[PDB]
Structure formats: C-alpha cells, structure tokens
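Subject: mismatched residue count in predicted assembly?

I count 1804 residues in my input, but I want to confirm that the predicted structure covers every chain. Input:
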Amino acid sequence: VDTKEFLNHQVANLNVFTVKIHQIHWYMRGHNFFTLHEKMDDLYSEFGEQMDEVAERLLAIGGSPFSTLKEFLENASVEEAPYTKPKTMDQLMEDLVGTLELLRDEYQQGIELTDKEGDNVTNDMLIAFKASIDKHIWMFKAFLGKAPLE
Amino acid sequence: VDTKEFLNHQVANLNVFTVKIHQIHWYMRGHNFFTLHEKMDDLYSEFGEQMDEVAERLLAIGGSPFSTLKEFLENASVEEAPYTKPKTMDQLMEDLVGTLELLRDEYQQGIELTDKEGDNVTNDMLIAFKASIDKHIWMFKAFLGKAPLE
Amino acid sequence: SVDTKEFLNHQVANLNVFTVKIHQIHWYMRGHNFFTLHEKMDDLYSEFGEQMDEVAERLLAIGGSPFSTLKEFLENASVEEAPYTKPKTMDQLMEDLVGTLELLRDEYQQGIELTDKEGDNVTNDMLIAFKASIDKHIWMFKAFLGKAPLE
Amino acid sequence: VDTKEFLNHQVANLNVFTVKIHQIHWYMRGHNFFTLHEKMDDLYSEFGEQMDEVAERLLAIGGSPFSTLKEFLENASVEEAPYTKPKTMDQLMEDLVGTLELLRDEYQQGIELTDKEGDNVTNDMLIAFKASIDKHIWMFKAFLGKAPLE
Amino acid sequence: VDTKEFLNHQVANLNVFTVKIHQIHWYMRGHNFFTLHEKMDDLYSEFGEQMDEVAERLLAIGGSPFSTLKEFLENASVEEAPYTKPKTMDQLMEDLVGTLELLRDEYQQGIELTDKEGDNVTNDMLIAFKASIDKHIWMFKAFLGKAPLE
Amino acid sequence: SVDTKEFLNHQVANLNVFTVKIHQIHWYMRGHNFFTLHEKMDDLYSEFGEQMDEVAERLLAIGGSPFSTLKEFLENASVEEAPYTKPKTMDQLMEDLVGTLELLRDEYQQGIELTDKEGDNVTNDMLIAFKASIDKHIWMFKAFLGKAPLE
Amino acid sequence: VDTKEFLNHQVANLNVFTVKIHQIHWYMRGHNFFTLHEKMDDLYSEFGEQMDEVAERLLAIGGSPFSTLKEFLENASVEEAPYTKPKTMDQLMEDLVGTLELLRDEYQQGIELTDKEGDNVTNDMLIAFKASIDKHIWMFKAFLGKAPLE
Amino acid sequence: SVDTKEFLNHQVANLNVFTVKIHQIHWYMRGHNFFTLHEKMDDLYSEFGEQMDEVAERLLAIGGSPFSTLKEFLENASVEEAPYTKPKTMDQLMEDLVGTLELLRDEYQQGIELTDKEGDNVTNDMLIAFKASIDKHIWMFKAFLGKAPLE
Amino acid sequence: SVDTKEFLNHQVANLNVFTVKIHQIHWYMRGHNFFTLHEKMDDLYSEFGEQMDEVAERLLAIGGSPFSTLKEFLENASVEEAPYTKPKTMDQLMEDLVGTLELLRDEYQQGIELTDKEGDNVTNDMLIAFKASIDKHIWMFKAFLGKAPLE
Amino acid sequence: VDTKEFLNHQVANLNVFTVKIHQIHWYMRGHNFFTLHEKMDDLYSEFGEQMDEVAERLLAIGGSPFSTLKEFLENASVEEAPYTKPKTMDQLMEDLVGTLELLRDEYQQGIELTDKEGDNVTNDMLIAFKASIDKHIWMFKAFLGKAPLE
Amino acid sequence: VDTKEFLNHQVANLNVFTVKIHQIHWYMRGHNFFTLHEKMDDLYSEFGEQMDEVAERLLAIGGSPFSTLKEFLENASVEEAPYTKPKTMDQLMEDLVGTLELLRDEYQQGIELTDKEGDNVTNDMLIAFKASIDKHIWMFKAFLGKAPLE
Amino acid sequence: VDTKEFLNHQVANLNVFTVKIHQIHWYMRGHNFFTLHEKMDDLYSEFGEQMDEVAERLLAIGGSPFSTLKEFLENASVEEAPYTKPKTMDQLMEDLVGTLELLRDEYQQGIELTDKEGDNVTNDMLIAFKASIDKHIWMFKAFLGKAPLE
Ligand SMILES: [Fe+3]
Ligand SMILES: [Fe+3]
Ligand SMILES: [Fe+3]
Ligand SMILES: [Fe+3]
Ligand SMILES: [Fe+3]
Ligand SMILES: [Fe+3]
Ligand SMILES: [Fe+3]
Ligand SMILES: [Fe+3]
Ligand SMILES: [Fe+3]
Ligand SMILES: [Fe+3]
Ligand SMILES: [Fe+3]
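Triage response: the counts match. Full output below for your records.
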C-alpha cells in the first residue's frame, strides 16, 4: 500500500525465512552436508542482517515493525512447513530457492513502490538486497544443475 | 519427559526470546537508548548461539528440533506480546529480566534432569548457559536498582 | 551541472560547520550520559568529516571547485553555529544536533531531486547513501530524547 | 541493444583494460615509478573485480558471458596495442586516462539503458562503478596537471 | 581401571586415531574431496589437542604418558590397517565414524570412572571432549545420510 | 546458601593476596631464568586476577557481597604473605608460588565438594575449571624445580 | 621523602585504588550500570599498569617496592571503606573522583620533588600519568555535572 | 638468455589464457559441487595470476619484454581455449582444468631443464616452485575425478 | 593559569584553520607527485585534527573553555587562510604548508616557555611532543622542496 | 632406492620423530622447562608439517604413503625408547639433536638421489627442509654449549 | 660539545652497539640461548629505532648525521672487540650491560646539556630513551643475579 | 675463497650496504622524497634480514661471522663514502643501483661456488636473495628511466 506496509511485510517474511534457513541447516543430510551446512550459516547471518536493516529503516520512516512470532505468522507470504518426511538435499535447496524467488519478486514490487513514492533511501536499500538475492538464485540454481531463471 | 523434550522446549523458548530481544532493541527510548540498543545486539547473538547449540545437541542425541514459528509458538513457555502501546525502558527491561529468570529456572530443571538421566554433555552445556544467565540477571537487575535475587 | 555543483559546494560549507558543532557538543557536554554521548560524538565527527571529503571530491570530479576556507564556509553555510556561552543540558545539546541533522536531511533531499533531474546518477546515489545514515541518526537521537523520529 | 548485450560488451572491455593496466605496470619508467607501479596493482584488482561482478550480474539475469580471449578481442571497444616504442609516464597515463573516459562514457550509456529497461540492480551496480572511474579520472588528470574534464 | 590407566589408554588411542585421520586425508578420492580433505586437517588439529591435553592431565595427576609408537600399538583399542585396496569416500567416513563412536563410548566409561573416583577435573575434561565427538558423529552420519545413532 | 557464599568470599580474599604475591615474585626475582619467569608472572597475574573477578561476580550473582578492601582481604585470607626482606633465590620464590597454588587447589577442592552437596552447579563447574588450570601450573612449576607434580 | 619513598608511597596508593575500582565495579547500581561497569574495567587496567610502571621505575633506581597488602595498608594515603550502606552511582563516582584528585595532587608533589632531585625519567613518567588523571577528572566531573576543578 | 626469455614470454601468454579459462569454468559450472569448486576456481585464479605477474617481472629483470596484449597471448600460447557453447558436466570442466595443468607442468619441466643448462638459477628455482604447486593441484583434482595423479 | 588557557585556546583556533588548509591543498593539488602528496595530506589531517582535540581537552581539564565555532576560530587564529583563486604549483602549495608548520613550531615554542614558567608540566610535555612531530614534518617537507630544514 | 622409497621412508621417520618430540615435551624437567616445553610445541608443528608435505609430494609423484604406526615402526631408521628412567634436559636435547642430525644426513642422501633422478620439486623441498634442520642443529647445539658440528 | 655534536656522537655509538648486539645474538651459547637469542633481536630493533630517531632529530635541528662505518668508528665511545675467545652467556651479558650503562650516563649528559641549551624536543627524546635503558639495566642485572646499580 | 669465506665476506658487505641505505634515507631531497624515504626503510629491513640469514647460515656450517665494524671495513668489497656534498636523488639511486649490481654479481659467484661444493642450502638461499636483488635492479633502473641491464 505504501513503503511502511511493504517494509513491515518483509520483516515478517525475513523472520520466517531465517527459521526456514535453520530448518535446512539442522535437518540436511547427504554428501554436500559440510559445505551447505556452513552455507546455511552464512545465509542466516546475511538475511538476519537484512531483517534488522529493514526494521530499522521502517523505524526511521515513522513505522512500527512487527515484533512477535504471532505477528510474523499472520503477515508473512513466506511459507513454512514442519519437518516430517526426510527430504533430499536438492529438495531442501529447491525450497530455499523458491523462497529466494518470492523475496526477489516481492522486493521488485517494493523497488517500484518506493521509486514512485520518492523514498530514495528505501529504494536503494531494496536494490542492494535484490542484487544479493539474484546472485544467490544463480548460485543455488547452479547447485541444482539449472539456469538462474530456468 | 526427557532430555530431548526439554531441549526441544528450549529451542522454542529461545526463538521467542530472540524476537523479544529485537522488540526491546527496536522500540526502546530514553537516555539509555544507545547503551541498551547495543547491549540488545549482544544478547541477540549470545542467545541465538545458545539456540543453535541446544538444537545441535538435540540432534546429536537423536532428536528432531522444532523448526517453524508455528511449532515455537505451540511449545514455548516464554511469552510474547505485540507492541501495540508504548512501553518505557524500565518496563522493557522488567520483561527482559523476568524472561531471563524464567529461562534460569527452566535451565535449572533441565540441569537436574540431565544429571538424573546421566547425560553429562547436555548437563555441562546447560550449566554454562545458566552461568551467563545468572550473570545477566545480576547486571540487568543492577541496572534497575535491585539486588540479583530481587 | 551548475546547480549540482552549487548544491555540493553548499554542503561542503554545511558539513564544515556541522563538524565543528559536533566537537562543541563533544567538548561541553555534562550529565549522566556523558561517557556514551562523548564517544558517540567522536563517531559522528569521523563520519560527517568523511561525508564532507567525499562531497568535496565528487565536486572536484564533476569539474567543480570546493570552498576551502573557514571564511567561505561561513559566507555560504545554512547550518547555524553559536559560541558556547551558557551551560546547556544534554537534552538541549542533542536537540541542536537533531535540528542540524534534520536540516541536512531536507537539503540532501533537495539535492537528490536536483541531481535526479540533471541526470547526475553518481551524485544522486551518493547523497542517497548519506541520507540513509542521517535518517538512521535522527531516529536514534530522537529516541534518546524520547520522541518519535518524525514528531 | 539490451542489458545482457551491454554487460557482455563490458566483460570484453574489462578484460582488455585489465591487460593494459598490466602493460603500463610492467613497462613504465620514470621518477614516479614506485607509486604508479603500485597504483596499477590497485587498478588491476579493482577492475578485475568490476569484471567479475559484471559477468556474475550477467549470469544472474540469464545471460552467458564471453569467456575467451578471442571473444574479448571480437567484442571490445577498448583498444590495445603491443608495447614497441618507449613511452613517457605521461603518455602511459594518457592511455590509461582515455580508456577510463571510454568506460565512463559507455557506463553512462549502460546506466541510461538499464534505467529504461527497469533493471535497477544493474543500474546501481554501474553507477557505483562510474563513481570510482570518475574519481580516478579526477586523480590521474591532476597527475597530468589537468582539470578532470579537460 | 583407575583414572591414570584410562587417560594413558586414551593417549595410545588418540595417536592411532590421529594417524588414521592422516590416512583418510591422504588417500581419499571422490567429488567431496576438497572439503573433506580440509575437514581432516581440522580433525587432525582437534584430536592432536585432545591428546596433548589428555597426556598433560595425566602428567598433572602424577602419571606417565605412553610416548612411543610401540607403546601406542601395545595399548590402543583403536584399530588401524595399512591402505592397500582403494576405499570409497563413504567407507573412509565409516572408519572415521566408527572410531569416533569407539572414543565416545570409552570416554563415557572414563566419565563414569572419574565420577566414582572423585576426579572432577578429568571428569569435566572428558565431558568437553565427548561433546565435540558427539557433534562430529552427528555431522559425519549426516554426510552418510543417516541419523546420528543409527 | 551461606556456605557457598562464604567459601567464595574467602577465595576473593585469597586471590587478592595471591595476586600481590605474584607481583612480589615478578619484581624481586633474580637469576638466569629472569626473562622467562618475569613474563610468566605477568601471565599468572592476568589469569588469577581474572579468576578473582569471576569468583566475585559469581558471588554477586548468587546474592552475596564480596570483600572489597585490603583490610577485608587480610582479615579473611588463608593465603600467606611476608614482606620481601632477605634475598631469595629463583627456586625459593617458585616454591612459595607452588605452595600457594597447592593451598588454592586443596581449598578449591573443598569448595567443589561444598557446591556439589549444596546443588550450585554453576559455581561447582567454575571451581573445577579453575582447579584444572591450577593443577596444570603445579605440574609445570614443579617441573621447573626438578620435581614431580605431587611430590 | 625522596624519589624512592614517593614512588613506593604510590605503589601502596595504586593498590588501594585498584581494589577501590573493583569495589565500585562490583557494587554499582542504576541506569548507567553498563557503561560505567565497563569504564571501571578500563581504569582497572590503566591504574594497574601505572602501578607496575611505578614499581619497576623504583626497582630501576635501586629501590624496593612494597609487595604485601599489609605494607600497602601501612603506607597508603588513599583510603578505603568496606561496602555496607548502599551507595548511589554519583556517590561511588564522587569517591572515584576524590581519589583521582588525591593522586593528581600527590603526583604534582612527586613531579616537583623529582625535578629538584634531577630525576628526569621519573619526572616525565609522573607527568604522563598526571595528564591522564587530569583527563579522567574532567570526564568524571562532567558525568557528575560539574566543571573539572569545581 | 634468449631461450630463457623466450620460454618466459611463452608462459606469460599461456598463463593469461589459462586465467580466463579458470574464469570460464568459474562462471559456467553447475552441479552438486558448485559451491566448493566455485571458490576453488577463485583461489586458482589468484594463484595463477600471481604466477603470471612473477613470470613477467622475472622476464623484465633479465632484460626481456613481456607480451602485454590479448592478441600477443593468443599468437603465442600453446594453451587452447574455446567459447562455452554446449553444457558440460563438472567432471568435464575439471578434466579440461587438469589437462591444462598437465600441459603447464610439462612445459615448465622443459623450462626447468633449459634454465639449468643456461645457468639462470633464479628462473630455475622460480619454475620449480611453480611446478611443486601444479603437481599438487594435479593430485587433488585427479582425486576429485576419482583418479590417481598420473593415470 | 590564564596565559596557558589563552595560549591553548589560541592553538585550538590555529589548528582548525590549518586543518581546513590541509584539505585545500589535498583537494586542489596537481602535478606528478599528486598520489603521494594527496594521501600524505590525509595523514597530516588526521594527526593535526588529533593535536587539536588533545589541546581542547587539555584546556578543558585545566578549567578552560575552548573556542568552538568557525567564527571564533577566525577571530582568534594567527594561522592565515586564503581562498583558492588562481592555480598554484605543488611546490607553492608545500611552501604554504611548511610556512604554517613553522608558525606553529614557533608559537608552540613560546607556549613551551610559558607553561614551563607557569609550572604547567602536563601542558608543557604535550606541547613538546607536538613540536617533536612538527619539527620532523618541517625537515621532510623541506626535503621535498630541495631545502635544508632551517633554511 | 628411488625417490618414492626415500620419501616414504621419511614419512616413517617424521612420525617417529614427532612422537619423540612429544616425549621430550611431556617429560622434561629443570630450569629451562618453560622455554623448551614451548620450543617442542613449535618443533612438533614444524615437523608435523614437513611430514604432511613429504607424504603429499609422494602422492603427487604417484606414490603411496605409509599410513599406520605399524608401517612407521617397520620402516623408520629413527629410533625410540619408552621413558623408564629420568633424563636431564641436556640428555633429552642430545637425543633430539641426534635425531635432527640423522634426518639432515638422510635428507642429504635424498637431495643427491633426487638430483640424479631429476626430480627438481622434491629436490627443492628437501633442501628447504634441511635449511631448517641445519638451523635447529646450530641452535640446539648452542643450548648444549657446543659448536654446530662438534 | 653542543646538541648537534652530542646527537651525532650517539649515532656513532648506537651503530657500534647495534653490531655488538648481533655479535652476542650470533655467538651466544648456554641453557638460556633460546630466550636471550630472541631478546637480542628485540634489543637490536629497539636500539636500531633509537638510532634512527637520533639521526632524524639531528637532521631536524639542521645537523648532518655520520653515515658511514668509518665515521662511526672514528667517533664512538662505545667499544667493540672481534670474537676470538669463546665467552659465557654471563660475560656477554656483562658486555651488554656495560655498554647500556655507558649509554645511560652519556644520555644523562645529553639530557643536562640539552636542558641548558633550551632544546626541549631533544631533551624529552633522550629522557624517553634513558627510561628504557634504565629498565634494561635492571632486567639484565637481574639475569646476572645483581641489583641494578651494583 | 670457499663457502664459509664467501658468506663471511657478505656479512661484511651487507653491513656496509645497510648503513649506505640509511645514508640515502637520511640525506635524500627532491620531489620523490616521501616514497623513496619509505622505500629505503623497506630495503633496510630486507637487507637487514639477508645479513642475519647469511650470518646464521654461516654459523650452521661451522663458521664464525665477522661481528665488528672494524672487521666489516677490513673485508667489504661494497664501498662507502662520507656525505660531504649534497647529491641528487638520481645520484643517490645510482649509488644504490650500483651496489645492488655488485651484490648481484658476487652472489652469482657464490651461487656457482656453492653449487660446485654441493652446499645446496646456501646455494638456494643465495638464489632467493639474488631473485629479489634482480627485481630491485629492474625497479630502480626504471625509476632512473633505464632498462634493467643497461
Ligand atoms: Fe540493529
Ligand atoms: Fe549451527
Ligand atoms: Fe567470482
Ligand atoms: Fe603440550
Ligand atoms: Fe568483571
Ligand atoms: Fe611488569
Ligand atoms: Fe606486478
Ligand atoms: Fe575528544
Ligand atoms: Fe595436508
Ligand atoms: Fe627513518
Ligand atoms: Fe637472527
């Protein structure tokens, strides 16, 4: 609706994603365990940092960030499912990639939204984030033997 | 119950607790803003580390950690509330200290349990976490003008 | 690029006055929050001195000529300074800080619009990066004062 | 020409330029040898890192970077010449400066094109690169005793 | 036995184990070579440290550590075999894991022994070691696509 | 938990005497092993001042009140001190050090048993970690003197 | 008192002061807890280092430092009191400030004294220590809301 | 030293082609080992770019004139390159890498024998050091391929 | 202590004008030595900004009240500034730099004599350490100009 | 004896030597305990690294390293003895020095052999190792109050 | 002699001392080799730095440092002797001490002289140097079992 | 002249040269002062290190290094001259370059001699030293606007 709605929505998103990353991190099995386990820790730090920056930018424009698991669940478009059946490393990475994709497309919407509201600072912050998400999408798709936009 | 269930319960508690720490971090105001904004950053890292160590130890012993916000909410005894009304620094710190005290007393229950079960590794892990928690209770209570045990 | 150059040179002047004011606060502050805000002012001083040098070199890079004397900074700055003559509270000093950060925020916003319209993309993004941080500072110092960022 | 085509052209350019920086670095003679010999190592790193980011951005948008010397030579607008006749430091810095100007001018075209197409990430990336190039032009022109735009 | 005999027994074990880790480090082949080759280095340092710490704790309680290959071979329960036939990465990891479990299980005896004997320092030393072994067991079993205890 | 508190406060007293004893040795030592042992005392000084602080802060965390004056430390310590009067050899000084280490080891052992029975697991493990290092220093300083750790 | 006796007097003072810093460190309460608790750690290091340098300068001029608590108590002009009555942060800082003022003025006596006895080294050392004490007095007075010499 | 000079200049050409090949592999690779190999190609890139600068500067130091254009490297390289057209498995890309490493090992071996005969000792030891590292890479990358170093 | 206070405050003023002069030189300089000198001014800027802050804080510590506006700095400084209007050579710029360093040397010498007479031993040593560094810069920059330090 | 045999023989030696370093490190007593206890740690890492490099060079030339204690004992010319009766610091160092000299001398044989075979890499590796052994011999000989070759 | 002559005399002395430290560093034997050997590198670097600061202060006052070995030999009061007869560690340390005492006492003259002359910078520089020299004398006399001024 | 005598000769040479580096470092004037002044600091450390390594290598082969200025003057082939007249920066670099060339050629003799004697360690040390010297010659000749061997 506006920048404050978008930013807050991403605070909810990033808190679900962050827990998803830990899910993959904890439950992964297979020959790529050691590298993807560590890779997940890197994603966790990186997206935890995005989330703090998003909330603090929300604060800076007069907004009020969601700040409970209850609120995050209610508001996030990012999905979570409990870990039940064993999943393949590729299936865990597909779920990671699908979420990276949703964030890319939503941030793209937020990039357009903020550009037309004239919120230059939030615009540029969202672009910086998308750049990194776009790079991760390429790399994780390459892990999956696929092209970035394939 | 057992060590697995206790440990899983703490995964849930620690996830609710880290988000609270962010809430305190985001909504704090007052002459102590700078010192406490930063101090909350430190608690965030430390309790995020505790969480990953609890989850991993649970994994090491044959368990399967909660790994969704839905599950954390279903299982945490740590309580959260949306920030729908302003709260002073002292009220936020009071909530923090009460949460630390809840974690201390629960960790104490787990320390006794793991000892009774003969799980020495989880026993020493939880003792080290309590050492830190006990230290924080002294310091944050000192901040509030109170003795550690109130 | 006349106005972009003029705007940049205006901010060189502003930043040199702001930076000395940051020292004034650093030097003269008293109160229970001295140790925290004393150090805080060191950080602010470094950062806005760096903003200043970047602003100056962006100007040079577009064929401009930065103001480079105290006399030029005074003739040109919209940032206000006053000698410290009578004691001020920590809150009074932080209000003067915030007022000046709000001033720089709004003027940088005009610079961002200006550079956007002249198509100076480098300068545009630079001023945007500076404003990001200024907006973050305003939130934090206002929280210290017990006020919402825009109230 | 679109964004992929522009980016891939710069992959070619950056690979020729990077070899030119090495040419200057190796053959330079004169009183400012020690500082400029070192400055060229810095330029080498920075522009090789530009190159990598341009190629990886290209990868992220679904393109395929040139990745052979033949391709770089076929596509580059940046020009190279073997080092036969000896040259003054000024002469070498004038080759370096002219090549910097070519890149600035071509990046400006890219900035505009990438804006038109709505590729915000590639847009910002190219603005950041131009910010550095523009700074380099001011500094190397000063070395030549010239204004940056003269 | 007593604490001295147990500690000395482990000095023997850890020296056989350390050489085994080198064996795996040297002879390993397969797609996970680079990360696993490096991992073995990490394990080599860690278990070299345990060994020095075990020997020094033994020294500090009035004991005399085994200090020759002859004594290690005479005393170790950890087994070794010359590398004659090629082994797969999985088989190598299985030898690693099986030795880690042997150590975990003997350390458990040492923990229990040392608790009866009242040697609190050696007790906690051995608990800290098992903590790490337990974590390694989880991770290498995960690499093997198995639960830690299966 | 009077006893855990009392034991901890006693060691606060002890460690402050011991820390000054380490400086005594640090300052007055002479002989061929000066450069090594002079620096070794600096390490011991840091480590035992760190123990002391952590003992005091744990006492604070259990609701105690740590001794915080030289007078209190002298009134309560079982660690002994003597002014440096007649010259002492390197070995003589190391024997005083080793002797104090042994006293603290044996007293920490008593506190380890005390905190066990009292159910204070945090203080229990703190004390164990401290004894681990003490026993290591005893082995090493006894080695310097040409003796076995427990002889 | 000559240079030796002055220095030896300060060894005693510095040891009482150092224990006083710990007292404040331990017992402090109030909203400035976190920053001032940490500040006491800094002063503790700094004045411990002053003390080691004073004693080693004494050693270097043929002197014999006091090296027991008994001697320190017998010789110190710096005073201590057991912590009984709870004290505000300001009261603790007044005590800190008061003792810094004592040391400043005694060091000034040491500076004059040591100039007269032609001990240039001890002279410059004490000046350096006074420079920092003077800075502390200014900063700690500002905390108390006072001018430095007020 | 014409033949030394000539050998060194030939390796400048080779190393520049190899380095772009490393980037080609780096950029296009796909498969379960992407994350490890992608970083490993960065290490290789740095290392062989470093070898290259060292080869060129040694050439400079002996009175030589390094090739310093893309055209000169192609005219003078024995390492071959081809545009990336059809998808290749990670093993195929590592086979191309190992093949090129082997070519350099073998050519450096010739350089080692040549500089020895000419008595250029510095170049000799520089080449040997480089070969040590290439021989090590061949072992590790053949092991990745499930193969023995020389099979 | 009025003269020490006034002298210190006079130097706060000087160092603020000098500091902006160092940026003027840093920004406007051209010529073959550009890269070294441009970076060297960044060094002088940091060092002299540090000197200034230490002077103000020492002035604070002796009960003084530092000048803290561009206006006060201009009203009190003996160091002179002039806007950059016509181009100047690197030597011309370094001569302006050296001239200012020499003024500060000579004034600091007066402050060393003054603080010595007034018995301000701390300010005395501070001024001497600053002069030590100023004297070495005069040698080095004179050396840059092909001059002996004192000619 | 060819290069592969020589290298494998050194794998055996270095593994016996490394344990002997630990023997000295653990059992030493006397006034120089602290520096020599430390120097043994440095030697252990250094000769542990020689060992790893020797084994890896053997790998790189198509060889197969000894990789068990049994193989090391079966193949080593370096001798070892349980610590049955206490040794002086001097005597422990003479045993250390004797082993350095043995290695030096054998490496000299390997350096000649490897020169005849035209293995330039292994040649240079062995020379670098001997450079260090030579230095240690001078240094440990000096500690013994003797010239390096007497 | 004036300040310039005094400063220049110390450049000569310090260059001789510099080489004397190497002589001791190279030729020393005995149980304290490893400590003292490293101790001489520290001393070498420290007094090398003193010498450099002495020369540069001379330059800064309009002087001209001796800058050839011939000039150092012609002007030094520090004495050197070729190493012909072997010396104990103590004898070497006594030569080191003797030279330190010589520098102490001549610096003391330079301090008095530079005070009269009104050269404050040089006065403080020499005082800082003498402080370190005084400390070395205490420490090296302690090594020799003696009081500092014995 | 054998290996011992050649190495000892370079001990002498290196001490003369290191003092020459200082002379140039102190007395240099001209527009390149700041970069060349620091470059001499680099050279001083580097050739300072060569000298120690030469002297310790000599020790290791049973020799006794020259260790007084008198012995260095009696033995050096490197020449020194008192700085009576100011020299140009180019003249100072010509003197520098000239001495590097002398060392290069004498190292070449030592390389040949040490090869013929079968001292592989010294051979390799000398080669490594010459590598750097050769690089310096290219670089300093480039500064002077000359080709390395011109
Ligand atoms: Fe934050
Ligand atoms: Fe983890
Ligand atoms: Fe890359
Ligand atoms: Fe050890
Ligand atoms: Fe503490
Ligand atoms: Fe000390
Ligand atoms: Fe290079
Ligand atoms: Fe300040
Ligand atoms: Fe290895
Ligand atoms: Fe210097
Ligand atoms: Fe050495």
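The CA atoms of residues 111 and 123 of chain J lie 5 Å apart. Marking this ticket as 'not a bug'.
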